[model samples]
Target: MEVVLKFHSFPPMPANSNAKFVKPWSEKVLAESNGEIKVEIYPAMQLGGKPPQLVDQVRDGVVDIVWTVAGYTPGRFPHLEAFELPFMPASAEATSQALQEYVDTVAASDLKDYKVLAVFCHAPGKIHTKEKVIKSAADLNGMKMRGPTRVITKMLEGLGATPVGMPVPAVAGALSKGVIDGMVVPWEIMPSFKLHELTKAHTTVSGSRGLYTTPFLFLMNKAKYESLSDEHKKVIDNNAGLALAKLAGQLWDGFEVPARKLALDAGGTIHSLSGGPLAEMKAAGEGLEKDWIKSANDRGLDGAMLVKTAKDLISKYDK
Candidate 1:
């Protein structure tokens, strides 16, 4: 083989989407190279180190490629937080396309060390609890909840839950041990994490827009990418960017259905917040967007413009 690429990610194979993604993408890349290139995937962080360390692993060339959530590294990619703000994302497909564009035009510098591949986000996140039926903002009061993204953790705090910071992989254990009363997560990941059985109730924010979504990235080491021959670069480029992002969006969106069904079939209770309660929940997140924009500005980014562009692109691509 002219190139042997090593891919790494946090989720387990045949268990979750990102891990599920590796095989097909690798095959395609290999076929595109006419067998001149080979790919090896190591999921569930089999290469060692935490999930948040993935971006750095690729950046430092410890791994040739990686899949990880940008928010896992908090503040390192400030513009990504725009999508995680409450009620910011609509459908996964739409939001993911918007995210790819945002990375190209706005957050490129933040990832200067990597060769960007596909970019996407999961379906909207919802609150799943061990016992609570969160019909209103008051239900979250004093509730102990674990969440992934930094923004959502604080938003959970504003919504009256005592937010706990933890990786998504650690959440099932936290719930099992009562370290957390619940968590905010997407339906797509429910089955993989076995959250459907762990959390007896799920509270969804009504309407097309969702409470929050975190950005996911598939990145290649810059040096490894530069070392590729022209034919290899063309193959990589063909498999990267917008088309792959949209495909990822569709995959996540598709996965959401059966995962939610697993919950329903388990006799789990599902609740939705709308009208007044939804408004109250939205109210709880009042300053989060502004606070994010203000902080993004602190890092010398044009925070306001970033938000405007992301929202516009998301809406424009809305299904």
Candidate 2:
């Protein structure tokens, strides 16, 4: 049996770490199954449709599997948004492990329609700008920035930047054409899209936790997943969950060093939020957390408990 996997970013790029993991996973499946199960990966959305449509494509069986950002569909996955809240994740490895457990419990309902293979997040997202050197919150005033999710968009808006919503692949063109002054993304992906070339400075939050992070899902068509023979199912079961999640996070976190070096080598400066600036950003983050909790409660979800669980898991893995 052959399974098709799709990714929104190119596979050969360092930033597209998900695809990197997928390729090896495919090879492993082929080897383990003795070619009984073959996996084919399509990168840069070569399987067709936009990035946001990936979840639906897999859900409807347009693709056998898909790797996509959870926030791409917005309100459709409310509980999953808890991980995206400001200051929620400490490290990608810890948070990725935590996210898998979190999903199996609190956020499982949101993913009921799909067979989730892995749940993880990228490295901590930071502010990358083309011309501006952001040292404080006030510097974001009147600046147009691209944000990955609605939660991050709100955080940017609260910080006084005009939030522009778009997928990661679109950022390079937007930056080149001067459509956005800057964007919020992790260092792991900076070089994949050549963001380091376009941006002159990067600003990171100063603390154990990051300013924000986006969750990702490696999903398989539910019917297709169930259709596999017991031996093939066992092979997939052996490779999914915390194992794959940790691998994904580890790949992303591991790339941060080289990616940052790429930026510095290119004469780009790296700034950290501290003192009064960090205080103000933290305050804004608190407000966003409260708002998310309120909204989650309204939707019959235990927002506060989910946050607590996520934090506890992150703390556990951080050690």
Candidate 3:
């Protein structure tokens, strides 16, 4: 039995992080099943459609499995948005473990239709620009920036920058063609998208949690999973969920130091948002959090409780 997994990013042959995680997961499944289950990988959106469409593709059985950002389809998975909140996540491993627990308790309903293989996050997202160095919130005024999710987009708007919503694949072209001034992303993925080559400056928020982060999901089509033989099903079950999430988080976190070094060695300047500027950015993030809670409440959800629970989980796993 062969299972095909699809992703938007390039293959591991080029050293992609997602591929790094997925390929091993596939191999493990094969080994555990004694080669009864063969796993095939389709990268670079080879199966068709954009990254945002991956969830739907898996849900509708257009694809057997998919790995994509939960924020790609904004508002579709509202509870998962708690993890996407600015500064909510710490290290990828800690936060990913926390996210798995959070999803099981609060956001499981959002993913009831599919078999969630793993839930994780990337490293802390920072500012990467081509021509400008962002030292303060004021420095972002009128700057056009690419934001990965709606929550981050709103945060950018609050910080006085214009937000351009797009997937990671579009970022390099957007930056190269002057469509966006810069983008908010983690260092781990810069080389995957060749962002360091397109941008000259990177900015980090000092003395706080990550400026922002995006949550990712590895989803399996329910029908496809159910159709698997009992033995193969057990293999998939063993390899999926929290364990896989932890592996993904650990890999992403590990990539950060080297990726940062790559950026700095390439003549790129790194700036820190601290003191008065950091205070201003934090204030803006707080406002966005409040607004998110209100919106969640309006939709009949216990928004404050969700936020508190997510924070508690992050704290629990952070240790």
Candidate 4:
């Protein structure tokens, strides 16, 4: 009899990178198992739950595996949220590796309920709008911007925008209905979210780093992982950890170009902020770094150390 594992995710099958990147390994796992193990994917919340609920669901074995954003649960995963802080690496490969290592060393015991297969982040996040381009911190005043996490909301608020909390699936609707004037997300998600049809303007920050991001996880139920034959576990192990995590991260990050191109081709205007505006926005978000560090400390974790470690790890692999 074959061992089958059920997978659930926040994004619809086509919208998320995991759906794309996980395929090869899934095939490899099946082949390695020689028809003895099967992996089934349920995309777009087919299992009927929100993105944040994915972790607990997997923990409870409601689902065998799940991929979701750590930011979704806020304080529940403070240490992991360090990667989502501003000014982090633009290179997903580096950040992904750092994330995997941090999880292995600092978070493995915390996540005992499930086995984390991969930890990653998306491309540097930017602003996508349907109206006036956001060129400065002052320009953001009174604008309604969709935000993914609590920290991302602070980033938008720091820029003088009114942050509207909502999931990614709600963004397109909000943009179309004028409920939100803009959003903070990466280019790779534009096509999947149909953001091109909803928005007319997009803006990116300067340099490798950007305004904000969301940390991600691909995890499996512990018992399910333990139940796998040693050989099957070996197949999974080969595709996990640092190198594989980096591959998955960078592959998604690299897709930003084509995804942006598709949006431009559909008649969207892309812009970048320069001069005092950019600097001001950066300054405004600076306090968030401190606030986040404080939050980490409250959790009995070392904020400064995690930041330094993440930076060092990212620097080592980013090049």
Which candidate should be chosen as best, given TM-score against the real structure? 1
Weakest ten-residue segment in model 2 by summed lDDT: 5-14
What's the lDDT for residue 178 in model 3? Answer: 84
Write out the backbone clash pairs for model 4. none
User: What global local distance difference test value does model 1 have?
Assistant: 0.87
TM-score of 3: 0.95
- What residue runs in model 4 are displaced by over 4 Å at the alpha carbon? none
Candidate that beats the other on lDDT, 3 or 4, i.e. the better one: 3
Which ten contiguous residues of candidate 4 have the minimum total lDDT?
16-25
lDDT of 3 by residue, 1-319 (tens): 6555443433233445445777777778878888777667777787777778888888998887887888889888889888878778888888999889888878889899998888889877999888788989888899999999998888899999999998888898998888899999999878877788889988998873878888888888898899888888889989988888888888889988888898888889999887898988888888889999999999878999999998888888886
Backbone clashes for every candidate come to: 0, 0, 0, 0
What's the true lDDT of residue 215 in model 2? 94
Model 4: per-residue Cα lDDT at residue 265:
91
Pick the lDDT winner: 1
TM-score of each: 0.97, 0.95, 0.95, 0.94
Compared with the true structure, all predictions reach lDDT values of 0.87, 0.85, 0.84, 0.79
